[PDB]
Amino acid sequence: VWLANPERYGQMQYRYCGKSGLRLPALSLGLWHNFGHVNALESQRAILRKAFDLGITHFDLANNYGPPPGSAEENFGRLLREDFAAYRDELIISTKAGYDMWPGPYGSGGSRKYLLASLDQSLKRMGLEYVDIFYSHRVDENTPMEETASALAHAVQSGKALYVGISSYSPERTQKMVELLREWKIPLLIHQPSYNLLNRWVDKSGLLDTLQNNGVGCIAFTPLAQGLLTGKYLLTEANLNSLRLLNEMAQQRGQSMAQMALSWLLKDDRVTSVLIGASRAEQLEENVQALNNLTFSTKELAQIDQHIADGELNL
Amino acid sequence: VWLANPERYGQMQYRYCGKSGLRLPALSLGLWHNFGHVNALESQRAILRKAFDLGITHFDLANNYGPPPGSAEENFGRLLREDFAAYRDELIISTKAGYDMWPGPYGSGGSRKYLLASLDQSLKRMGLEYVDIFYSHRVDENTPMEETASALAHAVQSGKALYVGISSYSPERTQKMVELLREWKIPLLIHQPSYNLLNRWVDKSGLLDTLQNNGVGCIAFTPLAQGLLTGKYLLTEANLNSLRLLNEMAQQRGQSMAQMALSWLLKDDRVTSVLIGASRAEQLEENVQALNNLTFSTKELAQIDQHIADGELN
Amino acid sequence: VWLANPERYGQMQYRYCGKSGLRLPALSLGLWHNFGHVNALESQRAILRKAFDLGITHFDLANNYGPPPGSAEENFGRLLREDFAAYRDELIISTKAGYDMWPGPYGSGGSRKYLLASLDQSLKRMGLEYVDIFYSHRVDENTPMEETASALAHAVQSGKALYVGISSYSPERTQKMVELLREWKIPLLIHQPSYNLLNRWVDKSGLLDTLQNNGVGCIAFTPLAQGLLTGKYLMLTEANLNSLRLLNEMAQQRGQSMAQMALSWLLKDDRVTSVLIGASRAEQLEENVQALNNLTFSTKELAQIDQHIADGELN
Amino acid sequence: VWLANPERYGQMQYRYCGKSGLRLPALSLGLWHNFGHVNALESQRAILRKAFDLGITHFDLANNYGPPPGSAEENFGRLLREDFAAYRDELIISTKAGYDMWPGPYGSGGSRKYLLASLDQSLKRMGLEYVDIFYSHRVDENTPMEETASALAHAVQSGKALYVGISSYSPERTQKMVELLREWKIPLLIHQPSYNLLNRWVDKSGLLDTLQNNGVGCIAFTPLAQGLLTGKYLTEANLNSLRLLNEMAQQRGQSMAQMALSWLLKDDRVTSVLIGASRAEQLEENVQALNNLTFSTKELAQIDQHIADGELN
Ligand SMILES: [Mg+2]
Ligand SMILES: [Mg+2]
Ligand SMILES: [Mg+2]
Ligand SMILES: [Mg+2]
Ligand SMILES: [Mg+2]
């Protein structure tokens, strides 16, 4: 019998997701790694318990997370049953379909066949009646967006998803999805782009403007650029020199490199949340302290950008 | 085996709820207090049985009623199983979501997540396939009403609620909710404001007009002003003085103070029902007698208001 | 094990119901009487089996048929399970709600509460997943027809009724229900009025114009005027009886019983989809279906029939 | 325990169905014959396993396939449970209602009663929660198309079919069905007409254009004209011209059947051809039609002349 920390909601910051009434914690837990069959369940159990004890109420999955595919959803489902039976209505659970999941022409893409069959598979693996958010995981240029939208719509109408999201859609395609969903009287809840210090496509492309204009939230995937924006590597000598200079700016702020990278994303109120792909419980404890310093000077932002340019860190 | 009073429908007055074809008893039972795990089930049983024997067919609940939260729904569900198994289709059962119910950001307010997870919890606690009326229990300024309305609409489309209501919404927000639900071809059935002799926000604000203009019914919550209108207290000296003068008017009518307060709400067609929160069976027998004198003269209505103004009883 | 007549579809006439693709037998069986707990089930069984062996595929019920109320549905459900388990998809089963069924304010009228609670009760009594036609049984002036229509629409969308009907609605109210159901993209299937030789409200009112203009079928209730148009009575006046005697003489000249002529008269053209026969024994069905052998009337005969009705004051 | 061929997706060609995102294999398996209660289940099993091993992921049924009616659905359902329990999400399974299925006024045609009762029967026989495509199997001139379309829409909204199709509808009635389903926000996925070298109503009539303009797929039923466009073989004149067509196939390095299938698949106007195989080896043979999908103008003219001259229509 496990009792979550009674003070779990006392320190975490929650942000409304776009124009919706749904509040996400400013850091959410992603299950892309660390939750497959290659990872001991004991380590997974410690990560989920620590996340919820820190107030992290959103756990982001996809059909193909593991490895092998599906196994993150299976393991999460087991841990939900063991440790979170009383707490499911305090959690926001997502999953997704769009990348390669199972073999053959219906195991990938944006088709109604793949999306609705995959959703049914994910619900069965996780042992849930519904997910809080179902995403289209990526753009399928070969399926008309009307088909994809109408599948997202069916998942909501049929009670298998409370809300729907998209991931890695351009501003123009985001706009079209919002309009198509509005035909079914469903607001697009949320967009999940890759977004961090080193990958600024969402600001350059004007995605953040499209999202605010349509009241859609934004949750940053790979906010730590897969370990580049942590202590980890402290590729080219110029890259590393600029990473060292960024780490010095973080130290000036009393922050770790990772904390500053997360604070940097959470400086825009147009970012709803940042997805932390934590591999041990201590990482969550350290990352959430980013919330202690969310302001940057003009000079700081200019210097950050200048170090990124110098080191050619825009990969 | 319990057999309800065969004459239960013979005396109660029923009112159509706004423009709808649903008839509510002019007095309904509210379960805000008295039905928690802190109250013995035998006392609850005797209240529910008496209410139905008097023709009271509408039982009003909300997710957080108890204490603790959820326990009034649980206890009601047990009693429905034990005593009302043959009668469920003779009852109108409501519940609601909006106030704090469970910890964290999804346990309060107007979101789709909270309303729909809460409704599922309530149906499970009560052992019901659906409720007859599902409410948004209060305004959430931080959820768009489009979202709250769509969640109510989903509850109806999916067969978990027959009708929908709102509680404590301004006239402007109530109008907007009527419009938003009409986009789903669902009429807003009912609004549950606080309304009694001493608190007439619904009238001054224009809400009663908004409800009639849209065919929405009105069920008065705290019609006895939480004891102020029962002579429980017979507060400033001028308050107390005006309460005693009100009680004298009641006595001139052959009524208790509680009975006059209820008759006053029921004096015309602007109120569908008044929600009585009984702690014992006898209170119900006494309150339903209000129906024997629903008439007030112009002079009586003026003198009531004068006493209230004089005592600053607003 | 009971095997229905292999030749059952060979002689019955079927009529498309209004503009729809649903074909009703020109004679249907109604369970208004003879199917209550006051009637032995062996008698009921003989009636249903005979009906179906004659090609009568439409069995018309209502929540309150018995007595007591609901017992016709229960008895029918038992016989369906015992004798018609392989034949349900060959049957058109209807039920209704609108008259007094259970005590109190939700047990009568047109409200969404009553209609939807009642349809659940009926499906449980009959042991069916759905009925083929669900009716509003009568007008409720105190429920808006938008509420009654929405209730019927919900029965269809939820899969508990394939089609919907109304009974005893005026032309103007019929037209409104058609428009209201069309907002849900549902056509009104059918109208069940009382209609027979002695009761021509449907003609005189304009109902038959409304039904044709909107493609709604018409199923005649009490086509034998509760025994007035049979052998039974040959309180009624001497003038009434004299005219009924002369009508029976007309029937005999056509080689028909009075009941057969009364049924042929309704079915003489395409304004009536079916006539509801309320048989109390198997033989009655055999006799009534033979009305189909003579559906033609001359202009002189029609005028003569009306004259005897006027002379005898039989309206 | 049966393990499908790991290389099954490596050679088959898949075509997007109309404007949709659903990819059908260029050859699909039809179960019109060979899957009845008159056919041993071991032979059916070998056929379905071979199909899937070749990458044929679409299996096309209808209520009344057998004989007796319903039996193809029942047998396919058994083989799905035995051999394809892990693979159902890789399959596209259709069924249909429209022709004579059961006795009486509700057992044929286009009515909501028939289509929805029939789909429930088909799901039960097959042991499926839903089919991937549900068809109206033929035109019913006595049911308003609004009724048929609404019943197809209900099958989709209720989760009993992912997509909807029609079969043997004129271009005018096709166009009407597309419009009616669009009122329900459902795209017509696919049309299944009879189409082969000897039967070109779909081209003559304007249908292929109607399908193209509305983004609807086209799957050819009886692509081998019921054995006429194979080795198998009614007049002396007919037989003469079938001999000559066979020579043209031999020039291309094809059997008559391979050429007849290549001819349908020669351009993008056909999504798939429905093969009704009676033994596994036929499928191995027919799939090689994909090796040669090109025809010169001279071949195309010569084919047509042999058919003209032989009376083959
Ligand atoms: Mg696994
Ligand atoms: Mg364990
Ligand atoms: Mg007990
Ligand atoms: Mg028996
Ligand atoms: Mg076997």
Q: What are the DSSP calls for chain D, one per residue?
A: --PPPTTTTSS--EEE-TTSSPEEESEEEE-SSS-STTS-HHHHHHHHHHHHHTT--EEE--TT-TTTTTHHHHHHHHHHHHH-TTTGGG-EEEEEE-S--SSSTTSSSS-HHHHHHHHHHHHHHHT-S-EEEEEE-S--TTS-HHHHHHHHHHHHHTTSEEEEEEES--HHHHHHHHHHHHHTT----EEE-B-BTTB-HHHHTTHHHHHHHTT-EEEEBSTTGGGTTSS----HHHHHHHHHHHHHHHHTT--HHHHHHHHHTTSTT-SEEEE--SSHHHHHHHHGGGG-----HHHHHHHHHHHHHHT--
CA of A53 to the centre of ligand 2 (A): 20
How many other CB atoms sit within 10 Å of the CB of residue B248? 12
For residue C213, what is the enclosing H or E element? Answer: helix C207-214
How many other CB atoms sit within 10 Å of the CB of residue A129? 10
Q: Is A170 annotated as a binding residue?
A: no
Which conformational region is residue A74 in: left (phi greater than 0), alpha (psi within -120 to 50 degrees), or beta?
alpha
Ligand nearest to the CA of B40: 3
Q: Binding site membership of D for NADP(+): which residues?
A: 32, 60, 65, 167, 192, 222, 224, 226, 232, 278, 282, 286
Going by beta carbons, is chain A in contact with chain D, meaning 3 or more pairs sit under 8 Å apart? yes
Best of C101, C106, C179, C185 to mutate (most B CBs within 10 Å, chain B): C106
How many other CB atoms sit within 10 Å of the CB of residue C99? 16
In single-letter form, the type of residue at position C313 comes to E
CA distances from B210 to B183, B188, B205, C22 (A): 18, 12, 9, 46
CA angle at D32 for the pair D29 and D36, rounded to the nearest 5°: 110
CA angle at A176 for the pair A172 and A177, rounded to the nearest 5°: 115
Quick one: resolution in A? Answer: 1.8
Q: Which chain D residues in 238-297 lie under 8 Å from chain A, judged by CB atoms?
A: none
Q: How many cross-chain Cβ pairs, C to D, lie less than 8 Å apart?
A: 63
Q: What is the DSSP letter of A22?
A: P
- Both tokens of D144, joined, read 């308003």
Which of A22, A25, A159 is the closest to B111 by Cβ? A22
Query: Would the CB atoms of A22 and B144 count as touching at under 8 Å?
Result: no
Spatial distance between the Cα atoms of A160 and C309, rounded to a whole number of angstroms: 64
Judged on CB neighbours under 10 Å (0-12, 13-18, 19+), D7 is exposed
Cα A238 from chain centroid (whole Å): 30
Which CATH number is B14-314's, of 3.40.50.10420, 3.20.20.100, 3.40.50.12780, 3.40.50.10490? Answer: 3.20.20.100
Q: Please list the residues that pair with C15 across neighbouring strands.
A: C24
Which of B21, B57, B92 is the closest to C142 by Cβ? B21
Q: Please list the residues that pair with B24 across neighbouring strands.
A: B15
Spatial distance between the Cα atoms of D55 and D68, rounded to a whole number of angstroms: 29
Q: Is B167 annotated as a binding residue?
A: yes
| Cis ω for the linkage preceding A103 (within 30 of 0) | no
Strands B23-25 and B14-16 come out as antiparallel
In single-letter form, the type of residue at position A244 comes to R
- Both tokens of D45, joined, read 């099993």
CA distances from B206 to B73, B174, B182, B201, B215 (A): 33, 11, 21, 8, 14
For residues A249-284, one letter each, b for 16 or more C-beta atoms within 10 angstroms of the residue's C-beta and e for the rest, the string is bbeeeebbbbbbbbbbbbeeebbbbbbbbbeebebb
Those chains having 3 or more beta-carbon pairs within 8 angstroms of chain B are: A, C
How many other CB atoms sit within 10 Å of the CB of residue B201? 13
Residue of D nearest to A107 (CA): D90
Residue A291 contacts residue A258 (beta carbons within 8 Å):
no
CA of D86 to the centre of ligand 3 (A): 48
- Nearest alpha-carbon partner for A180 in A207, A205, A212, A151: A151
User: What fold, for D14-313?
Assistant: TIM Barrel (3.20.20)
> What's the longest Cα–Cα distance across chain C?
54
Q: Which residues contact C151 (CB under 8 A, 6 or more apart)?
A: C110, C111, C112, C115, C116
Terminal C-alpha separation, chain C? 48
3-state secondary structure of C18: coil
Q: Tell me chain D's radius of gyration from C-alpha atoms.
A: 19
Q: Please list the residues that pair with D161 across neighbouring strands.
A: D131
Cβ of B6 under 8 Å from any chain A Cβ? no
Residue A195 contacts residue A275 (beta carbons within 8 Å):
no
Judged on CB neighbours under 10 Å (0-12, 13-18, 19+), C113 is buried
3-state secondary structure of C241: helix
Residue A165 contacts residue A192 (beta carbons within 8 Å):
yes
Spatial distance between the Cα atoms of A35 and C192, rounded to a whole number of angstroms: 63
Cα B212 from chain centroid (whole Å): 18
Q: Which residues contact A235 (CB under 8 A, 6 or more apart)?
A: none
Cβ of D23 under 8 Å from any chain A Cβ? yes
3-state secondary structure of A161: strand
Spatial distance between the Cα atoms of D138 and A241, rounded to a whole number of angstroms: 72
Chain D positions in Cβ-Cβ contact with residue A154 (cut-off 8 Å): 159
3-state secondary structure chain B: CCCCCCCCCCCCCEEECCCCCCEEECEEEECCCCCCCCCCHHHHHHHHHHHHHCCCCEEECCCCCCCCCCHHHHHHHHHHHHHCCCCHHHCEEEEEECCCCCCCCCCCCCCHHHHHHHHHHHHHHHCCCCEEEEEECCCCCCCCHHHHHHHHHHHHHCCCEEEEEEECCCHHHHHHHHHHHHCCCCCCCEEECECECCECHHHHCCHHHHHHHHCCEEEEECCCHHHHHHCCCCCCHHHHHHHHHHHHHHHHCCCCHHHHHHHHHCCCCCCCEEEECCCCHHHHHHHHHHHHCCCCCHHHHHHHHHHHHHCCCC
* CATH 3.40.50.1000 given to domain A14-315: no
Residue B291 contacts residue B25 (beta carbons within 8 Å):
no
Q: Is C65 annotated as a binding residue?
A: yes
Which conformational region is residue D96 in: left (phi greater than 0), alpha (psi within -120 to 50 degrees), or beta?
beta
Cβ of B179 under 8 Å from any chain A Cβ? no
- Both tokens of B177, joined, read 């909710």
Those chains having 3 or more beta-carbon pairs within 8 angstroms of chain D are: A, C
Cβ of D159 under 8 Å from any chain C Cβ? no
Spatial distance between the Cα atoms of B81 and B61, rounded to a whole number of angstroms: 16
